[PDB]
Amino acid sequence: RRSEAITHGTPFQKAAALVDLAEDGIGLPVEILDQSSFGESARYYFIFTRLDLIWSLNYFALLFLNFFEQPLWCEKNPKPSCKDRDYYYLGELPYLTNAESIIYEVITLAILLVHTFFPISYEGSRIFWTSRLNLVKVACVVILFVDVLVDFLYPFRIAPYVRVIIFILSIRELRDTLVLLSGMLGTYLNILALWMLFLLFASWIAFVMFEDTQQGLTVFTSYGATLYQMFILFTTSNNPDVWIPAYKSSRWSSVFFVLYVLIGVYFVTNLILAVVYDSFKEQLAKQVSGMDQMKRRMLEKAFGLIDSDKNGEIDKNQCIKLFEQLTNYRTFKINKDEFADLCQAIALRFQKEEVPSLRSPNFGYAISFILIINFIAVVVETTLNWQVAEFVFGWIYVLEMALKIYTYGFENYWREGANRFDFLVTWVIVIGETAGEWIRYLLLARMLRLIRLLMNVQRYRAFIATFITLIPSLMPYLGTIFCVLCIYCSIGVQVFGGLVNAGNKKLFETELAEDDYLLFNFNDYPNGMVTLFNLLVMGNWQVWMESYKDLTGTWWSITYFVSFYVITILLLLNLVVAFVLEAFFTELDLEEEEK
Amino acid sequence: RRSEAITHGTPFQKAAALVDLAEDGIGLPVEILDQSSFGESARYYFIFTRLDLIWSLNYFALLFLNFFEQPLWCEKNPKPSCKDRDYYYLGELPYLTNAESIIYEVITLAILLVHTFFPISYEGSRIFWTSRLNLVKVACVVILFVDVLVDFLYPFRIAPYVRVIIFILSIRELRDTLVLLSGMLGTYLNILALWMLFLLFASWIAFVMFEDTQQGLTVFTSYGATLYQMFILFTTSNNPDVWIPAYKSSRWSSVFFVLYVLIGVYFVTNLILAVVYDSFKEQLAKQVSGMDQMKRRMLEKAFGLIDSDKNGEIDKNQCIKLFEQLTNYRTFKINKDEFADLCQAIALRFQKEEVPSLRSPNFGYAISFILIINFIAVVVETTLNWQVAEFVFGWIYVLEMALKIYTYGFENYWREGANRFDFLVTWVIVIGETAGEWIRYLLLARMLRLIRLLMNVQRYRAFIATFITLIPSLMPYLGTIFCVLCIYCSIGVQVFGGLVNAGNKKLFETELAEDDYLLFNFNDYPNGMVTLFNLLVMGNWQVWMESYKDLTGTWWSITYFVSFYVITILLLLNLVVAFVLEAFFTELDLEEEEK
Ligand SMILES: [Ca+2]
Ligand SMILES: [Ca+2]
Ligand SMILES: [Ca+2]
Ligand SMILES: [Ca+2]
Ligand code: NA
Known part of the structure; x- marks a missing residue:
């Protein structure tokens, strides 16, 4: 799906590239796809998307800033101060000083401004300013700019909410999940x-x-x-x-x-x-339909690149010229629909990816035997029935990584969902050789790959295969739940912070004190997150509701817990159940088609 | 579906009757359907099924006997005796004396022997003794006969288990649910x-x-x-x-x-x-397929009665002769399959049942206004903002019952699922006029019918309609869960009975004593049933497990609770979830077909 082919190629190379993009499921923006001279616009879109790691890191940094800010109730001079973490049952994460917060916020806002305004390089000005998504993002960045400025100047703070909104808006799958949810x-x-x-x-x-x-x-x-x-x-x-x-x-x-x-x-x-x-x-179903419309729009743009005469037809001398640029670079007359059907049929039967430029099947057996030997070594070591053995296995795993990236090349290797994890954990292992036992758990995190061998066991194949596909495909929904917890956490720390403290005296009547739950409080953002996890699990959940009702002296406090239950349990977790069920039935139908 | 027509009719009347049976979902047994004579064999089957109320009452009596038996640990002379119900945290149901138990068991066993051997009147002897179901029932009745005799003679008792097995075997939908479960x-x-x-x-x-x-x-x-x-x-x-x-x-x-x-x-x-x-x-799906095979076998014997010359044929004169006996009583050549297609099509598109032998929509509006007036009367009465008003409404409800049974006849009236409940609660009301304040709840149990008017609200139709259809159709599954609870209860009282008592001293260290759960114990069958309900709800369920582990001094006690969780929660309640989901989707597809 080469950027160079889209940017510089002859029209037949542009057509083959757009086809490979579309069937790899990547849409160019309509703001590029709808214009004739789109190559110079597409140039900037590719340099923009080359930087996705930098932008993603900026968004995760911006979201995680919420975990390291000092609670606002600590700024308004408590006695004792929040240095007495045991008196307020606080967590273990540091609180950033004002200097550190200013540095962090200035850096992350500068990268956010670049990411939010750089699209005006490939979209035009009027096209940029008429996008509703861009306008909402500009509102968020200006709110963060004003919030930064009004404390570089040195009853609540807006920034933590806007950071979560920016994070939602910056991940396509999260925007999609919220659009889906708005229909329900x-x-x-x-x-x-x-x-x-x-x-x-x-x-x-x-x-x-x-x-x-x-x-x-x-x-x-x-x-x-x-x-x-x-x-x-x-x-x-x-x-x-x-x-x-x-x-x-x-x-x-x-x-x-x-x-x-x-x-x-x-x-x-x-x-x-x-x-x-x-x-x-x-x-x-409505979402998958929209994705099929995107795919068709790209295929129609490809046909509009080959047909330069607008008669709506291409001949066999053109068609073989496309067929080469497809079947040896990525894998009667024709018309606008016939091309789309023919190409998607190629995507069905003939389509297998060519390897990029620059391995034996039994190698999988060798590494499976090595990691089962490592597992039986680990068990006999934990029961105390060797650092040199753990070293030699760590060496074998890095040698396997280096050999596989050498034989396939990283651009082919990294495509697999498994080996990119094996790579990550192997890197964390070897960087752990900084000279404890924690490497035990990293090597067993590699050992988990042994469970894929139960997909050979037909009675387990559907279950294991569904679990493996669910690991990535639930991340948009779990991430939406996570963002909802982040908002509820910020509200909780705003409204309940500081009430659970060792001098409260009412607290020791409150059931939270009797059940020993005093560390599960809203005094701090990580404390609130773990508390909200306990609420999401529903185990003993009404203890917190009744205790904070007592501590606040108002029934209106229950609006927090009731609304949390109504949003998260009855809707979002039921959505997760539906998603898991539909995934399993899809796997059973896929096996029923293989047989 | 006239038994007279099957037993005595001319072959065209027998054919029309078998058709109306098959398409109303009642199967004559194959032992009759293949008998080549619907005479004396069918005669006895209809009196047998005429007695269904007597048999059903005998089976419920036999099951409920478990709730009124003395626990075996009380028979082995505790100090104090089980007359000290407070010392053993016992329930409020009486324990039958030995004389009462003997009378109850003798009566129920006599009616059970009749029900179990009467089929040899219409099945033949060899047909009877080769049925596996009959052999299992005979084994159960001989076990009950031995268990009766062995104490009319005056480590554990077998009867309470055999009574539950007899109850399962005596209801077709429970046998069906167990054969379904055996495939899972x-x-x-x-x-x-x-x-x-x-x-x-x-x-x-x-x-x-x-x-x-x-x-x-x-x-x-x-x-x-x-x-x-x-x-x-x-x-x-x-x-x-x-x-x-x-x-x-x-x-x-x-x-x-x-x-x-x-x-x-x-x-x-x-x-x-x-x-x-x-x-x-x-x-x-396998169950519904078997029901369709039963239906086809019945239609094929209807044809085999009309084509008694075994032509392989029916002519138009025979066909219109059947057509009158169908369309004038119960709602061109043809062949064995064409008959079945034609008749099932007639059932689909044309059949609408005639009334039996011996009302305007404003009557429904009138009773809806009367019951809503009754509801606003009840609310303003409970808030204390009249026995003569409750009396006059009770009179109106019995007058409605008498009017509807007059206008339609009971044989037509009683067919609706609603009005048979309205009849039941109205009868319980009027027999409750023994002259009390409890009638409020019975009149509001009639008031519940008002919820059906929300099916006129399209946004609520599918929900309410599914809930109404679920009320009857879940009974086989809920009843299977009830029989499992009954078996576990009998085991629990056998193994845990008498351990929760005020002299135990270890009990007051056991968490059961600290959570105040001492009435939720296995000293008695009703106590066991309510305890097992609390286990089925999973609320705090590990309290009982840990407490009885401590009271018995063995980890083997946990096998009871673990196996109960594995059987009931992970399987049977998930079955109930699946059933409810599939019912809702069926309702949406029905509405999508009707709209
Ligand atoms: Ca701030
Ligand atoms: Ca350790
Ligand atoms: Ca007995
Ligand atoms: Ca009362
Ligand atoms: Na608890």
């Missing part, structure tokens, strides 16, 4: 309406049924208290604890709570999952 | 192999990683302790509790447990659900 929201709010109606009605029955009982006197003291407890019971997290007083008062009370939990989980929760799954399928 | 088991044990391999490897890494830490010294003290804790963490039920000492030692420890829980839940649990779902689909 309309149908999601309907079933939330029915779920609320269910909770309200079940809570009304429960309230009027227990009003003068011990359950009434001690748990269901009001309709709001009932609705709160019944909401937590929908999650099952407070079962059976919430209805023990009823069961002590009468064993028949268990029938009500049995019916409630049975209906709430096995009917209502599964139907919410089903609604989310159907909507996800509809939006994914 | 092979593929289920494969993914259990990978799940165990995942637990063992993750637990080995965790063990060697923490060995000299506080996590090692206090939680991961051995490989077996690690594997046990990591298995509970796979359930999430001990998150974050299990790894707080690691997090106190180093915050980076959280990354291990985050990755473990992320992989274990969102990859492994979802792929187990996917495997179960695919296997369920394959087995349900």
Whole structure:
């Protein structure tokens, strides 16, 4: 898919290059594809995309800055200071000084300005300024510039939110996931309406049924208290604890709570999952259609490069001239659609990639035997039934890397999803030879490759193959969940920071103190992230909700936890379930086509 | 579907009857259908099926006997006796005396012997004694007869297990569910192999990683302790509790447990659900195919009754003679397959059932207004903003019942799934007029019918329609889970009965005593059932496992809880999820066909 062919080649080379780009799934921007003299514009797009590692590193740096900033409650002079990390149950990451924060922010903003305005080199000015994505990015960069300036000048801070928005906007798969999700929201709010109606009605029955009982006197003291407890019971997290007083008062009370939990989980929760799954399928189909339209647009541009006369036809003397530039550089008359069908058929049957310029099958057996020997060595070493053996295996693994990159070349080697990981962990190993036991886990991280041999076992092939394909293909969804946690974390540290401290005295009544959860707090960004992970797992989750309700003295604090549950569990994790199921069924159909 | 027509009719009436049976989904047994005589054999089958209510009541009585038997540990003379129900934290159901047990068992066994041997009236002797189902039923009844005799004579008791097996064998949909499940088991044990391999490897890494830490010294003290804790963490039920000492030692420890829980839940649990779902689909397809073969066999014997000359043929005079006996009672040559296609097409496009022997839409509006008025009356009554009003509404509801059974006749009325429930709750209401405040809940149980009006709201139609169809169609699966719970309950009372008592002294160290769960014990069958419900809900489920491990002093006790988790949660509840999802998608496709 050579940039040089697109930039400089004769039209037949440009056509073959656009074809290989399209069927490798890479679209040139329409702002380039729609113009005649596109080569000089494309020149800049390729130098832009050559720098993707620099831009990606800048975005991950900008996002990770949130983990190293001092909490705002520490700036407003607490007694004692946040140097007393044990008094405030804080984490172990350093807090950047003002000087360090200024340096970090200035550097990352300068690279962000370059990345955001450089597209005006290949898009034109009017084309640039009319893109909605560019306008939103310019708004984000100007907000970060003003936020930098207004503290280089030296009740809340905006920057951490804008950094997460910039990160979302800078990864195509995350933008795509949010566009997909925006199509699901309309149908999601309907079933939330029915779920609320269910909770309200079940809570009304429960309230009027227990009003003068011990359950009434001690748990269901009001309709709001009932609705709160019944909401937590929908999650099952407070079962059976919430209805023990009823069961002590009468064993028949268990029938009500049995019916409630049975209906709430096995009917209502599964139907919410089903609604989310159907909507996800509809939006994914719409996305794949859009990608097919991109592919067709590129193939039509290729035909518009070969046809310079606009008669809409190419002859066999042109067609063989394209067929060479395809079948030996990347792998009757024809018309605009016939070309697209013929080429996608070539992409089906004949298409196997040629190797770039500049290995035996049993070599895989040799390295598999070596890494199983290494595994049995590691086990007999841990049970204490050798640094020179760990050295000689590390040497063999770097020798394998060097041999494979020599025989195939890195531009061919690095294409495989496996060997790029083997390369990464081998590099981390050899740079670990800085002269502990941590190399044990790196070599076993290589040993994990042995699990691919279970794809030879037909009863396991589908499972292992789906797990392997899921590792990369879930990253957009897991990353969207991660960005949602980052926003909720910044809110939590803004609204709850400093309340969990060793002098609070109310804290030691709060259940957070009784369950020993005091390190899972919102005093710091990493603390908030691990707390939000515990919330996402739903294990004991209402402990934090009830404790921060006590510590803040307001029921409005529960809006945080309720909204977090409604967004992340009932929607995003159900989306993950749907995605895993659809991936597995796709694998079974692929095997049913292989056989 | 007239039994008179099958038993006595002219062959054209027999043919029309067999057709209406087959297309209403009722199969005569093959032992009749192939008998070459629908006479005296069919006569007895219809009186047999006329008695279905008596048999069903006998089977439910036989199953429920388990809830009223004295636990065997009470018979072996405890001090104090089980009359001290508080000392043993017992339930509220009575225990039958020996005389009552003998009477109950003798009566139920007599009706069971009748039901099990009466088929030899229409099946022949050799046909009866070669049926595998009959032989298993005869083995069960002879075991119950021995177990009765061996205590009418006056280490464990077998009867409670055989009663559950008899109940499974006596309901067709439960036999169907078990034969379906037997097809899934092979593929289920494969993914259990990978799940165990995942637990063992993750637990080995965790063990060697923490060995000299506080996590090692206090939680991961051995490989077996690690594997046990990591298995509970796979359930999430001990998150974050299990790894707080690691997090106190180093915050980076959280990354291990985050990755473990992320992989274990969102990859492994979802792929187990996917495997179960695919296997369920394959087995349900095999079931529907068998039902279609039954339908075809019935249509082919209908043809074999019309073509009693074995022409291979029916002529137009015969065909219109059948056509009258069909279209005037129950809703050009032709051949064996053409008949079946034509009739099934008539069922699809033309059939609409006639009323049996012996109403305007505004009546539905009137009763909807009356029940909404009743609802606003109930709400304003409970908030205390009338027994004569509750009486007059109860009268209106019984007058509606009597009017509808008059206008349509009970044989037509009772066919709807809705009005048979309305009839039941109205009868329970009017027999409740024994003169109480509890009738509020029965009238609101009628008020629940108002939710059907949300099917008129297109954004809610599929959800409500699927919920309504799920109410009956999940009963075989929920009932299979109930039978599994019954067997586990009987085992639990056998092995754990009497250990939770106020004199145990070890109990008050056991977490069961600290969480206040002492009423959730295995001292009694209803206590066991509610305990196993709490286990099925997975809320705090490891409390019982760890407490009974401590009370029994052996790790072998955990086999009970582990096997219960593996059977019920990873298989049967995933089956319920698959069933609900497939039902929803079927509803969306139905609406997509109707719109
Ligand atoms: Ca700032
Ligand atoms: Ca009351
Ligand atoms: Ca017995
Ligand atoms: Ca160590
Ligand atoms: Na807990």
